[PDB]
Amino acid sequence: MKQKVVSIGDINVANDLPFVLFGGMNVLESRDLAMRICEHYVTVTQKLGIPYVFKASFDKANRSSIHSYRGPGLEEGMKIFQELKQTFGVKIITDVHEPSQAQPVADVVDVIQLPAFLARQTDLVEAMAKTGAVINVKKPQFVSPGQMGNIVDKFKEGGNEKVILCDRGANFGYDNLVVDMLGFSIMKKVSGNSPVIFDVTHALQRAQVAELARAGMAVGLAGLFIEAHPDPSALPLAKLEPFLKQMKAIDDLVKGFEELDTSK
Amino acid sequence: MKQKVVSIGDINVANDLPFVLFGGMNVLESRDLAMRICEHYVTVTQKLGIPYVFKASFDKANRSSIHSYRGPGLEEGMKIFQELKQTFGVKIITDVHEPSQAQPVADVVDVIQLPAFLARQTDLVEAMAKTGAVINVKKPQFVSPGQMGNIVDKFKEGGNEKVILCDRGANFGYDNLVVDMLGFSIMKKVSGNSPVIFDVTHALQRAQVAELARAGMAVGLAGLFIEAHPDPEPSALPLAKLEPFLKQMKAIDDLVKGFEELDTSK
Amino acid sequence: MKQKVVSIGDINVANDLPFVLFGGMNVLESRDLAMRICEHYVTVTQKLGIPYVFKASFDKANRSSIHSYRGPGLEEGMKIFQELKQTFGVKIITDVHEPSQAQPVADVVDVIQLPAFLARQTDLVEAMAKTGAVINVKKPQFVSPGQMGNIVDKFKEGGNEKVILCDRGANFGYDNLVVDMLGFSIMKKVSGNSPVIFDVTHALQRAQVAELARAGMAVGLAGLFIEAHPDPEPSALPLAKLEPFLKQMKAIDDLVKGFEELDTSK
Amino acid sequence: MKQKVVSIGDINVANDLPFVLFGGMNVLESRDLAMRICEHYVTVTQKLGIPYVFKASFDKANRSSIHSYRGPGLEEGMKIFQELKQTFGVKIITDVHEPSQAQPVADVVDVIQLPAFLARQTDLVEAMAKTGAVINVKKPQFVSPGQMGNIVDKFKEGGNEKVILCDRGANFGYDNLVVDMLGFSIMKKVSGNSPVIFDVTHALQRAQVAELARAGMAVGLAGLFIEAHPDPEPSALPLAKLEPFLKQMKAIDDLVKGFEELDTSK
C-alpha cells in the first residue's frame, strides 16, 4: 500500500520521500537566540536542500519547580514565531498543552504537536483534531509502537488526517530510554503507513546524537526531529551542517535502494 | 525520622498506622451502581474495622474513542457525591484532570487525585495544591520511585503538605507492568516518609489480585487502592469477594505493623 | 491439581506446606566460618520449627577475573560439607557448574543447584538429572516465568522429577533486577505445580531484605533462599539478625498458608 | 585511541575498517546443505569484495528437549568443516560449549565463539583463551554493554587479545529483545576499542533483518553476523536474498566509514 503523504505547505512528508527536518531549539528563551538559531538552520537547510520546519516551545508545562523558568508564554511566543515567519519565511512547529491553545496556536504556526505525557488525553486531542492543522504526535515512552494507530484513529474521528508519528524512545528500566529501531515500521503499519519521524534529541537525554540519528535514518524514515544550541541533550549549533550532510547522504542512499523483501 | 501522618478528617494515613482502604469503582456509571458499590464497601469495612475512603471518577479523560462513555461530568458527579455523603457519610476521593476542576471538586470531596499521566503538569499541581485538599499522587508507570520527591516538593512550594503517594506499577517492556516491591521504601525516603499506598488493580498484569495485594501489604504500607465491580464484564475485583479479600489484607497488615523494628543494614 | 511434593530426607517441599529455608552463605570461605554460620542457622531453625537445608558454594565459577577468589574448589569443599554433616546432621545444597561435577557432588550433598546462566545447557541438566538428586533450578534473570516448564520437562526426560524452581529476579533495564511477584504462580502453573522458592539475596541486584522477603512469603511459597554473613563487609543478611528475620517469615507463612482459598477472578 | 585490530588469516577486523561478514547457517544439518550455503556465501562475498567468515554450529547445546537434533557433534563436525576449507578455502567460525572443546575445535577452526549464556563462565573463557585462537564473544542479553570490558580483561589474563565483541540484543521485558544502537560505542569504549560486530538474526525480537541490519551498520561497526537458509519456512535470512542484502550493507558501510569525524559533544 502507498505511503501516506502529509503536506506542511509546499513540503511533503512521507516514508518514501526525502526526509524532512523538524529542527530548532528547546524553548524561546530570547528573541535573539530564537532569531540566531533559526537563521543557522535555514541557511544550512537552504544550502543542503532539505525540507525544513522550525521548532521551538513557548512553554515548558512540565518542569520540576513552579518557580523555574517556564518560557515566553502563548502570547509573547506567537510574536516571536511571527517575526520568524516574516524574517525567514520558515514553516513553524510547537507543542500545545491545553485544548484552549489548539486554535490560537493553530493559525500562528504550521505544525502543532501533542506532548508525550498528554498524548492520550482525549480533550487536548479533539481540540487539536478540530483545528485541522498539521499534527505531530509524540509517542509516549510508555506505550508500545503497535498502539499508535488508535491515537491516529482518534484524530481521524475528530476530523483531522494530517497526522505525523514521532518516536522519542521507549522506557528501559528506571530513568533510562532505548530506541527500538524496529518500532518505526510497526508504527508505520498500524497507522495506514502514516509518516514516521524520529526525535533523536529526546531519545538521548552529545557524542551519540550522530550514531543514533544515522541508525534511524538508515531504517528509512519520513523525517527527523531535533534541537540544537550554540552552547549546550541538544546538538551544538555549529555542527548542524556536517550532521545534516551525513543525515542526507544516508537518507538519499536508503531511499534509493530498490525494495528488499527479506520475509521470503 | 517518624512517619508523615496525612489526615482525612478523623482518619489518619501513615506508613506505620493501620492501612487505609481507598476503594471504590472506576467511573460513576449510575447512581444505583455507585450506591450499591459504596454500600458494600461501607458495611464490609465497618464489619472489619478498616478506615475507608470511597473512590470513583466523575470523568474518564483518556479512553481510546472520542465517543466512548466518559462519566456524568463534574456537575452531576459532585451531586452523586453529596448524595453518597447524605446516605453513608463516606469520605470521598476522585481524580481531577484540569486546573479549573481542582477547587470545585475539593469543595465537595475529601481527597483529590493527580492522574499518573498528568503527574508532572505543574499547572494542575499548582491548582490542586492551592486548594489545600489532601492529595493522592498516582506515580507514573514511567518515572522511577526515586523521582517522587520532586512532585511532593512541587506541592510543598505550592502550599500543600497533605500528599499521599500511590504506586500503580512500572513499565516492563511493551504493554506490561511489574510492581517493584522495593520502590515503596524509596518513595518514602525521597519524600520525608510521606504515606505510600498501592493501587493493586491498575498495576494488575484476575485471581492474582490477592497475591499482589498480599505482597504489597506485607511490605508495610499506609494503604491500599482498589476498584471493584458486581460483574467485571483497568481490572476490577468482583464485589462479592471484597470481604474475604480485605480479611486477608487486614490480617497481613496488623501482623506486619505489629512487628518489632528490624534493621538488616547491620 | 495437587501441589507437587519434593522431599529431601525428612523434609518435604511443596507450595502448600510450611516453607522450607535454604539458607547459608555465599562461598565456603573457611571451614571455621562455615561451621559458625551453619551452627547459627541450625539453632535458630531448630528453635523455630523451620525445615532447613544449609547452602554454600564450593566454587564461584563466574566472577570477573581469572584471579578472584573462587572458593576452596570441589574436592576441599566436599571435605567441609562432610564435616558439617557429621557435626550438625544438616542437609546440604550447593551449585554445580559442569556436567562432570554433578555425580561427585550429588554423592555428598542432598540438593544440587543449576545456576541461572546455565539453566538451558542440556548436557549439564542431563548429568544432574541422572544423578537422581533433588534439583534446585535458579530461574534465569532473562527468561520469563512462563518458560520454566521446559526445564522441568527436560529433567524428567533425564529421569529426574525432584525439581524445585527458584526465582532470583528478572532483568529490569541495565544492571538492575526487579522481582515480579506474579511470576511465582505462573512458574507453578507451567510446571505441574512444582515447588517454588524465592532467592531474596540475589534478587537484591540491604535494609530491604526483610521487606522483599515478606512480600514474597506473603504470596505463598514453598520456600525461601537466603545467604547471611557475620560481617557483610552479594547482599547478605547479617547473621545476628537471622532469628528476628525468620520469626517474621514463619509468621507470615503460617498466616498465609492458613488462609482459605480465595478466587478473585470471579 | 586507535581501533584495536584482530586478524583472521588474511582478514582484518576493526571498527574503522570495511565491515567483515560472519555468516552462514545455524547448525551443520548435513554435508550437502553446508556445501550449498557456503558456496553461495563465498560466491556473493567474492563478487562484492566483502571479507568473509563462514559460520555454523557443530552442536546446539541448549535446545528445549534432550532428544531434539543437536547437530553432528565435535568429531563429525570438524570433518565437515575440513571439507569446507578444502572445497572453498573459507575461514571458519564456530561456537564451543565446554572447556575441553576449545582446543580440538580451535585446531580446525579460525574463530571460536563464546555463547551468550556462557560468556561469564571463567573456566570456559580460560580454556578458549589458552588456544590462542581468535575469539568472538556473544554479548549476553542480560549484561549491559558497559560490562563487556571484564570479559575482554579475563581473556587477556588468559593470554589472549584477539577478542571480537558481538551484540545480539538486550532483554526487553519478557520474551523480547531490543537492540540498543548506543551500546556499540559503550562496548567499544570499555574494551580498549575492541572490534564490535552485530548479530542481527538472533536480535530479531521477522522480515526486517534489512532495516535492523541497516541501522546497526549505519552506526559504524567492524562487522555483521548473520545466518541464512534456502527455506526459512531465531530468524534466518533467505539465501537467495543474500546479495541484495549485502549490497545495501556494503553501501551503508562504505558511506559511513567514509565520513569525516563528527564530534557532537561540543
Curated annotation (Swiss-Prot), chain A:
**Pathway noted in the entry:** Carbohydrate biosynthesis; 3-deoxy-D-manno-octulosonate biosynthesis; 3-deoxy-D-manno-octulosonate from D-ribulose 5-phosphate: step 2/3; Bacterial outer membrane biogenesis; lipopolysaccharide biosynthesis
Q: What is its main location?
A: cytoplasm
Q: Name one GO cellular component term.
A: cytosol
Q: Which GO terms describe its molecular function?
A: 3-deoxy-8-phosphooctulonate synthase activity; identical protein binding
The record's InterPro entries line, in alphabetical order, gives: Aldolase_TIM (IPR013785), DAHP1/KDSA (IPR006218), KDO8P_synthase (IPR006269)
Location in the cell reads: Cytoplasm
Q: Which one GO biological process term can you cite for this protein?
A: keto-3-deoxy-D-manno-octulosonic acid biosynthetic process
**EC nos:** 2.5.1.55
Q: Which domain of life is it from?
A: Bacteria
Query: Which keywords does the record carry?
Result: Cytoplasm, Lipopolysaccharide biosynthesis, Transferase
Q: Which major enzyme category is it?
A: transferase
Q: SUPFAM superfamilies of this UniProt entry?
A: Aldolase
- Binding partners and assembly: Homotrimer.
Q: Which family does it belong to?
A: Belongs to the KdsA family.
Listed name of the protein: 2-dehydro-3-deoxyphosphooctonate aldolase
Origin species, per record, is Escherichia coli (strain K12)
Species lineage, top-down? Bacteria, Pseudomonadati, Pseudomonadota, Gammaproteobacteria, Enterobacterales
